[PDB]
Design a protein around this ligand. Sequence first.
Ligand SMILES: [Mg+2]
Ligand SMILES: [Mg+2]
Length: 89
Amino acid sequence: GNCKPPYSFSCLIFMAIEDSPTKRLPVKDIYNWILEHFPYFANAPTGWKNSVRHNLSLNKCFKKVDKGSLWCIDPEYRQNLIQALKKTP
DNA sequence: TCTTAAGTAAACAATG
DNA sequence: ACATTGTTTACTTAAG
Ligand SMILES: [Mg+2]
Ligand SMILES: [Mg+2]
């Protein structure tokens, strides 16, 4: 990991959850998927975690689920994330 | 232009 | 006593 990913935090989260076996992921698990699949953030300046939690709460695309709690993709905005994913892969 | 997405920092409350 | 998690405001840059 030497360069910043071309994907935005919204897409990284979407790729992490979508790769999950159940489309549901706690925050810390989302951290890992971003690290394992993107090692740039290993040496990246602290704050991307913050930017992640910031992105999960106000982005209409993600909705919490409580029966840390799990995050999932919103079915009505899922089409929105895929489009941004195809743009710059 | 008017608008919105996006990144980052910072400040908390709620959580266990 | 504490780190994690979650919400909120604020200033900035790029894109359309
Ligand atoms: Mg959300
Ligand atoms: Mg930017």
